[PDB]
Amino acid sequence: NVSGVQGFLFHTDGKESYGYRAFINGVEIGIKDIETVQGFQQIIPSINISKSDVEAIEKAMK
Amino acid sequence: NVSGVQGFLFHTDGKESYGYRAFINGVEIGIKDIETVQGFQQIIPSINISKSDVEAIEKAMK
Amino acid sequence: NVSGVQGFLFHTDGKESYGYRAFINGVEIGIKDIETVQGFQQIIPSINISKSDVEAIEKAMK
Amino acid sequence: NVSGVQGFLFHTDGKESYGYRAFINGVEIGIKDIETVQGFQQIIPSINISKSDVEAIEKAMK
Amino acid sequence: NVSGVQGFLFHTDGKESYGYRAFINGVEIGIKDIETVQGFQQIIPSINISKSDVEAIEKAMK
Amino acid sequence: NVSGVQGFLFHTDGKESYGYRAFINGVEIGIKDIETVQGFQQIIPSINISKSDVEAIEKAMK
Amino acid sequence: NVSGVQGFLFHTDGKESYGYRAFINGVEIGIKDIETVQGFQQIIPSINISKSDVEAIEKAMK
Amino acid sequence: NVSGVQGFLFHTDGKESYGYRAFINGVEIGIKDIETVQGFQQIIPSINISKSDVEAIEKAMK
């Protein structure tokens, strides 16, 4: 890993979308633009997380 | 490495399910939705642990 | 290693079986169910240790 | 590893360019010349970040 | 890496055996049973050390 | 990396050449001889940096 | 490296042999038996060092 | 990794030789004999550095 970035993008394909978010070096952020999603997808994984599970993930990525 | 996540998903296929759980960076969580299970299966392993063995694993992961 | 687990399963195929055990991040545990053995075999090695040698291994894995 | 540089180049292809920027060993810089962009592209990744998302990434990389 | 064990087995094939010994995470132990030798041979190397050379190796591994 | 050296050579192919320079374990040096450039090219990357960008790179490689 | 040993065997093929020696985790030792040389050759490199250079190497491996 | 040696050999092929030198675990040494040069070439890189550039490299490796 040469990027200096550890984390992942997350979104849900279920009923109540929250858009795309990411953990970037242990900091959670919202992503506003699809360009940015595509850019980060070059260096970090992009996974699915249900809206109901986001809270628990945040606890673990705290 | 790049995901910023070390850990694993665990469940039992035995007669009394406890659903899916995970250790994520040393923190134990419940996972509510199968979307989230499949998301995390892209970046961390997913193993079987019997209901009777969860206690010892929880203690070892302390 | 993405699991956050270092260690191994151990058992003997000799006269006085002690079932399966494991070292998980330097903590020794008994394993009650074969499901759990199979699960851990996905992420950590599974080796043979004679009953007579368990005591010495415990000293080294202390 | 061998370069002594962890980080990435970022730019947007959107309507209002901010040129190329980089995080180099946790320090954010502007890059003035495309020669330098192509030089750094030999050793670190180069991704797209929208203008609207730069703020959050800057905060996360703090 | 994943085993949580760094070290090696040692023995001599010379005229006076000292059996099998091991350094396991910096701790020297005797191994009593060949089952255990073969178990550990799945995860750590197994080398020859003459009886006359064991002393110096023990000191170096201090 | 077995060399004990992290860094890179840099030069520009643009108007105002500054010759070859390098960062070697976070220390910037001028290189006087092409032999030395060729030698370091065996163990560290060699990239292009415009004269106008050298100042900003020095800030990040400080 | 799973052995827990870093170093090398050394000998000279020149006029004034000093037998085989080794650095084992920064400790210099003489090796008395060829069996031991063969054993260590399974886990660490074996190189040539002239008798005249041993003193300088010892300084660096101190 | 396994050798316990990080560094490199250096020499010039220019008109005034300084022989072979090495940085071995951050310590600069002279090498007297070509046997030793070839021994170390099995485990660490060997590069060219002009006589005029040795000073700057020595300072950088401080």
């000191």: which residue's tokens?
A: E59
Are residues F11 and F30 in contact, defined by beta-carbon separation less than 8 angstroms? no
Task: Give me the residue from G1, G2, G36 closest to E53, CB to CB.
Answer: G36
Task: Give me the residue from A27, A33, A35 closest to D60, CB to CB.
Answer: A27
Report the gap between the CA of F50 and the closest CA in chain H (Å). Answer: 23
Are residues A45 and B19 in contact, defined by beta-carbon separation less than 8 angstroms? no
How crowded is residue F50: how many other Cβ atoms within 10 Å of its Cβ?
22
Output A56-60 pairs: Cβ under 8 A, ≥24 positions apart. Answer: A56/B29, A56/B30, A56/B31, A56/B32, A57/A10, A57/B24, A57/B29, A57/B36, A58/A28, A59/B27, A59/B29, A60/B22, A60/B24, A60/B25, A60/B27, A60/B29
Beta strand C27-30 with B46-48 is: unpaired
The span from the first CA to the last CA of chain B, in angstroms, equals 21
- Cβ-proximal residues to B24 (8 Å cutoff; 6+ apart), any chain: A57, A60, A61, B5, B6, B7, B44
- List of domains in chain E: 1-62 (3.30.720.190)
Residue D47, CA atoms < 13 Å, CB-side half-sphere:
27
> Measured between alpha carbons, how far is residue F21 from residues A16, D24, F10, F34 in Å?
55, 18, 5, 11
How crowded is residue F28: how many other Cβ atoms within 10 Å of its Cβ?
17
Alpha-carbon distance A59 to H38, whole Å? 55
Alpha-carbon distance E50 to H6, whole Å? 30
Q: Which two tokens stand for residue C38?
A: 């199979």
Residue of E nearest to G2 (CA): E6
CB contact under 8 A, B4 and A6: yes
Secondary structure (H, E, C), chain A = CCCCCCEEEEECCCCCCCCCEEEECCEEEECCCHHHHHHHCCCCCEEECCHHHHHHHHHHCC
Residue (of C25, C24, C20) closest to C10 by Cα position: C20
Alpha-carbon distance H23 to H12, whole Å? 15
Determine which helix (DSSP H) or strand (DSSP E) holds D8, and give its type and residue range. strand D7-11
């270092």: which residue's tokens?
A: C6
Residue (of D16, D5, D14, D1) closest to D39 by Cα position: D5
Experimental technique of record: X-ray
CB contact under 8 A, F32 and H53: yes
Q: Would you give the distance in Å from CA F42 to the centre of its chain?
A: 13
Do chains E and D have 3 or more beta-carbon pairs under 8 angstroms? no
Q: Which two tokens stand for residue F16?
A: 């105002």
Residue type, E29: I
What burial class does residue F30 get, using C-beta atoms within 10 Å of its C-beta: 0-12 exposed, 13-18 middle, 19+ buried?
exposed
């090498």: which residue's tokens?
A: H31
Cα–Cα–Cα angle for F2, F6, F9, nearest 5°? 120
How crowded is residue E42: how many other Cβ atoms within 10 Å of its Cβ?
12
Q: Is A4 left (phi over 0), alpha (psi -120 to 50) or beta?
A: left
Q: Would you give the distance in Å from CA H20 to the centre of its chain?
A: 6
Residue (of D29, D24, D20) closest to D8 by Cα position: D24
Resolution in A: 1.7
Residue (of A33, G2, B46, F15) closest to H1 by Cα position: G2
Alpha-carbon distance F20 to F34, whole Å? 8
Q: Is D30 left (phi over 0), alpha (psi -120 to 50) or beta?
A: beta
Q: Does B60 touch chain A (CB under 8 A)?
A: no
Report the gap between the CA of E34 and the closest CA in chain C (Å). Answer: 8
